[PDB]
Design a protein around this motif. Structure first.
Motif, PDB file in Angstrom:
ATOM      1  N   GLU A 196      42.212   3.223 -47.136  1.00 46.12           N
ATOM      2  CA  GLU A 196      42.981   2.996 -45.910  1.00 46.12           C
ATOM      3  C   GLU A 196      43.818   1.742 -46.056  1.00 46.12           C
ATOM      4  O   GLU A 196      44.973   1.715 -45.634  1.00 46.12           O
ATOM      5  N   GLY A 197      43.214   0.767 -46.739  1.00 45.48           N
ATOM      6  CA  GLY A 197      43.919  -0.409 -47.190  1.00 45.48           C
ATOM      7  C   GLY A 197      45.125  -0.027 -48.022  1.00 45.48           C
ATOM      8  O   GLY A 197      46.205  -0.494 -47.764  1.00 45.48           O
ATOM      9  N   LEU A 198      44.935   0.844 -49.002  1.00 42.37           N
ATOM     10  CA  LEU A 198      46.037   1.358 -49.805  1.00 42.37           C
ATOM     11  C   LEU A 198      47.084   2.103 -48.978  1.00 42.37           C
ATOM     12  O   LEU A 198      48.245   1.908 -49.219  1.00 42.37           O
ATOM     13  N   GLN A 199      46.696   2.909 -47.979  1.00 41.33           N
ATOM     14  CA  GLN A 199      47.639   3.727 -47.204  1.00 41.33           C
ATOM     15  C   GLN A 199      48.504   2.684 -46.513  1.00 41.33           C
ATOM     16  O   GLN A 199      49.720   2.710 -46.637  1.00 41.33           O
ATOM     17  N   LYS A 200      47.822   1.677 -45.931  1.00 39.09           N
ATOM     18  CA  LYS A 200      48.437   0.685 -45.058  1.00 39.09           C
ATOM     19  C   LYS A 200      49.497  -0.092 -45.811  1.00 39.09           C
ATOM     20  O   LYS A 200      50.594  -0.220 -45.341  1.00 39.09           O
ATOM     21  N   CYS A 201      49.148  -0.489 -47.020  1.00 41.14           N
ATOM     22  CA  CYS A 201      50.013  -1.192 -47.921  1.00 41.14           C
ATOM     23  C   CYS A 201      51.211  -0.334 -48.277  1.00 41.14           C
ATOM     24  O   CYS A 201      52.333  -0.795 -48.277  1.00 41.14           O
ATOM     25  N   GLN A 202      51.013   0.940 -48.539  1.00 42.63           N
ATOM     26  CA  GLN A 202      52.149   1.702 -49.022  1.00 42.63           C
ATOM     27  C   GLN A 202      53.170   1.830 -47.917  1.00 42.63           C
ATOM     28  O   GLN A 202      54.360   1.845 -48.182  1.00 42.63           O
ATOM     29  N   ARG A 203      52.648   1.903 -46.696  1.00 44.33           N
ATOM     30  CA  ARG A 203      53.435   1.921 -45.470  1.00 44.33           C
ATOM     31  C   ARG A 203      54.155   0.593 -45.269  1.00 44.33           C
ATOM     32  O   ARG A 203      55.310   0.552 -44.929  1.00 44.33           O
ATOM     33  N   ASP A 204      53.464  -0.498 -45.551  1.00 44.47           N
ATOM     34  CA  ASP A 204      53.963  -1.824 -45.246  1.00 44.47           C
ATOM     35  C   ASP A 204      55.209  -1.961 -46.088  1.00 44.47           C
ATOM     36  O   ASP A 204      56.274  -2.260 -45.561  1.00 44.47           O
ATOM     37  N   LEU A 205      55.094  -1.537 -47.341  1.00 44.12           N
ATOM     38  CA  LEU A 205      56.195  -1.613 -48.291  1.00 44.12           C
ATOM     39  C   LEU A 205      57.358  -0.736 -47.860  1.00 44.12           C
ATOM     40  O   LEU A 205      58.474  -1.180 -47.834  1.00 44.12           O
ATOM     41  N   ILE A 206      57.092   0.464 -47.412  1.00 46.25           N
ATOM     42  CA  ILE A 206      58.181   1.260 -46.912  1.00 46.25           C
ATOM     43  C   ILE A 206      58.950   0.526 -45.812  1.00 46.25           C
ATOM     44  O   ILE A 206      60.203   0.543 -45.746  1.00 46.25           O
ATOM     45  N   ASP A 207      58.163  -0.038 -44.878  1.00 46.65           N
ATOM     46  CA  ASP A 207      58.734  -0.658 -43.683  1.00 46.65           C
ATOM     47  C   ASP A 207      59.167  -2.128 -43.862  1.00 46.65           C
ATOM     48  O   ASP A 207      59.728  -2.706 -42.943  1.00 46.65           O
ATOM     49  N   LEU A 208      58.976  -2.731 -45.041  1.00 49.41           N
ATOM     50  CA  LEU A 208      59.210  -4.147 -45.200  1.00 49.41           C
ATOM     51  C   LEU A 208      60.673  -4.466 -45.077  1.00 49.41           C
ATOM     52  O   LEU A 208      61.537  -3.922 -45.786  1.00 49.41           O
ATOM     53  N   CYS A 209      60.875  -5.415 -44.188  1.00 54.76           N
ATOM     54  CA  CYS A 209      62.178  -5.962 -43.905  1.00 54.76           C
ATOM     55  C   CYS A 209      61.875  -7.356 -43.396  1.00 54.76           C
ATOM     56  O   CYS A 209      61.531  -7.461 -42.227  1.00 54.76           O
ATOM     57  N   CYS A 210      61.965  -8.369 -44.294  1.00 57.42           N
ATOM     58  CA  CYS A 210      61.774  -9.731 -43.835  1.00 57.42           C
ATOM     59  C   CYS A 210      62.367 -10.804 -44.773  1.00 57.42           C
ATOM     60  O   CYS A 210      63.197 -10.541 -45.663  1.00 57.42           O
ATOM     61  N   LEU A 211      62.019 -12.056 -44.444  1.00 47.76           N
ATOM     62  CA  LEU A 211      62.354 -13.209 -45.260  1.00 47.76           C
ATOM     63  C   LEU A 211      61.379 -13.271 -46.393  1.00 47.76           C
ATOM     64  O   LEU A 211      60.193 -13.510 -46.175  1.00 47.76           O
TER      65      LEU A 211
END
Ligand SMILES: [Zn+2]
Ligand SMILES: [Zn+2]
Lengths: 138, 143, 13
Positions: free
Chosen positions: B94-109
């Motif tokens: 679930e940690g892995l799912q979450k991470c893969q999502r985070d990367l898809i959605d990453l938009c930051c500084l």
């Protein structure tokens, strides 16, 4: 030029506003470029673009978004990565996209769309971010 | 041009034109255009390659360990020990799912460490935009 | 165009 299986548009995704596309974009499909004759500088390349906007309408993998400068349209959203789900009216999101049409209404083929609604500041900065960046390209 | 320390962030095309001789830290607002790699635990640490953009450039990056550990909730050691118990390994997945999502959605500084000889940077830390960032951008446009 | 995240995604180009 990377992993096989990743091929990206030639120049990067330039941040823009609907209005700029509507008014300063030139050429036609596959050959797009933005005019900066106003500040006497040369044309910039429009392969990909980076836009931001609120969702007005969502129909399958089509969508109409709006930024402060106006409405823009997106297709092919059924093919991009799905993060937090955000094809809902009223969400604020970002698109990366390849320009299809510029006028009278800009159309993009999506490569990505990502939720930005869990932080209002994104919306507040969008219009300044666009401008700051256009100012730092020679 | 712009000094490379100007708040709230600078541009990768500006950094490039600087022609840095040494490894250089900058900060930029980017998102990931694409991964170029699968999550690795070789070396006993997390790694993943990506292309990002800040709107001015594309740039190959690798995430530091500390980022990927905080996205997953598990270090490489913890992940290995998780493999010995079904319940804990599920939490890793679930940690892995979450991470893969985070990367898809990453938009930051992103604070990026850029090696000029190698055309390759290392993402050191991530940060979300705030009011201060906004003011800085205001001030810099004289607005 | 193609990009990879959890898997490959392909875009008409
Ligand atoms: Zn319209
Ligand atoms: Zn370290």
């Amino acid at each position: 030029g990377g992993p096989a299986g990743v091929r990206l548009p030639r120049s990067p995704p330039l941040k823009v506003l609907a209005e700029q596309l509507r008014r300063d974009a030139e050429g036609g499909p596959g050959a797009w470029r933005l005019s900066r004759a106003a500040a006497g500088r040369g044309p910039l390349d429009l392969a990909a673009v980076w836009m931001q906007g609120r969702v007005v309408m969502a129909d399958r993998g089509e969508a109409r978004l709006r930024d402060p400068s106006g409405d823009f349209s997106v297709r092919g959203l059924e093919r991009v990565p799905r993060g937090r789900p955000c094809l809902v009216p009223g969400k604020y999101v970002m698109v990366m996209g390849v320009v299809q049409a510029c006028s009278p209404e800009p159309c993009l083929q999506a490569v990505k769309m990502t939720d930005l609604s869990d932080n209002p500041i994104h919306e507040s900065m969008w219009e300044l971010e666009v401008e700051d960046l256009h100012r730092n390209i020679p | 041009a712009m000094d490379l320390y100007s708040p709230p962030f600078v541009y990768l095309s500006v950094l490039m034109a600087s022609k840095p001789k040494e490894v250089t830290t900058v900060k930029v607002k980017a998102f990931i255009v694409t991964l170029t790699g699968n999550l690795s635990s070789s070396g006993g640490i997390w790694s993943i390659t990506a292309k990002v953009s800040d709107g001015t450039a594309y740039l190959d990056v690798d995430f530091v360990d500390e980022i990927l550990t905080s996205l997953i909730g598990f270090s490489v050691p913890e992940m290995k020990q998780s493999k010995k118990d079904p319940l804990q390994y599920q939490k890793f997945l679930e940690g892995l799912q979450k991470c893969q999502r985070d990367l898809i959605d990453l938009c930051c500084l992103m604070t990026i460490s850029f090696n000029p000889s190698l055309s390759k940077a290392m993402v050191l830390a991530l940060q979300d935009v705030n009011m201060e960032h906004l003011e800085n951008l205001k001030k810099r446009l004289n607005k | 165009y193609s990009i990879l995240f959890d898997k490959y995604y392909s875009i008409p180009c």
